Structure 1
Amino acid sequence: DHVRSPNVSFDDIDYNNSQDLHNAQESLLREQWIRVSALKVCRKALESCYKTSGPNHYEDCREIAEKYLNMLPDHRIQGFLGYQKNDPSK
């Protein structure tokens, strides 16, 4: 039916086991589309708030717009090759 995301961080696996490495790539992707969807819902509130408030949209939608701009830069598909082929700890 609705198959879930097999949460597997790259740091737990050895890339030699190809079946595991596939899981860590798929899991990182499926957690990135959820963030984009949560961006759409957040922006779906900003549109409704802006219209209903009218002239008040600078105060009745202040936090919603502020959160949307804060989350915009990093709520987009980034891919797994960025974190698979890099180790941030070094």
Structure 2
Amino acid sequence: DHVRSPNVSFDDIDYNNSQDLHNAQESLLREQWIRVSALKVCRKALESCYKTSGPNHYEDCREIAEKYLNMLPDHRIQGFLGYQKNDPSK
């Protein structure tokens, strides 16, 4: 069946526990692929809106186009090594 992500954060585990570390790496990766799936769905709305609107695509799809360009810089796979090996608070 559809197995779900084992939500686990690098900030609530001990890296000496190899199983907990493995789950944190997997959980972060699976959340990043959901963002890509969301980005593709939002782009599908932009494609459908552009075709049906015709010369009205600037007005009819203004909010959709703005949303796509804001999500694009960060709705991509970023990996887990960056956050696992770095502490933003410090």
**TM-score, length basis structure 1:** 0.99
Match of 1:29 in 2: 29
For the aligned residue pairs, the C-alpha RMSD in angstroms reads: 0.3
Quote the Cα distance in structure 2 between the aligned partners of 1:18 and 1:58.
Answer: 51
Quote the Cα distance in structure 2 between the aligned partners of 1:19 and 1:6.
Answer: 11
Match of 1:6 in 2: 6
Quote the Cα distance in structure 1 between the aligned partners of 2:58 and 2:11.
Answer: 44
Quote the Cα distance in structure 2 between the aligned partners of 1:83 and 1:2.
Answer: 27
Q: CA deviation at 1:33?
A: 0.2
Q: CA deviation at 1:58?
A: 0.3
Count how many residue pairs are aligned between Structure 1 and Structure 2.
Answer: 90
Q: CA deviation at 1:70?
A: 0.5
Q: What are the equivalent positions in structure 2 for 1:34-49 lying under 5 Å apart?
A: 34-49=34-49
Residue 20 (1) aligns with residue 20 (2) = yes
**TM-score, length basis structure 2:** 0.99
Q: CA deviation at 1:53?
A: 0.1
Structure 1 runs of 4+ aligned residues shifted over 2 Å read none
Quote the Cα distance in structure 2 between the aligned partners of 1:17 and 1:55.
Answer: 58
Identity of aligned residues (%): 100
Quote the Cα distance in structure 2 between the aligned partners of 1:67 and 1:57.
Answer: 15
Q: Alpha-carbon deviations, 1:32-81, whole Å to 9, x = none? A: 00000000000000000000000000000000000000000000000000
Q: Which runs of 5+ in 2 are unaligned?
A: none
Quote the Cα distance in structure 2 between the aligned partners of 1:65 and 1:71.
Answer: 10
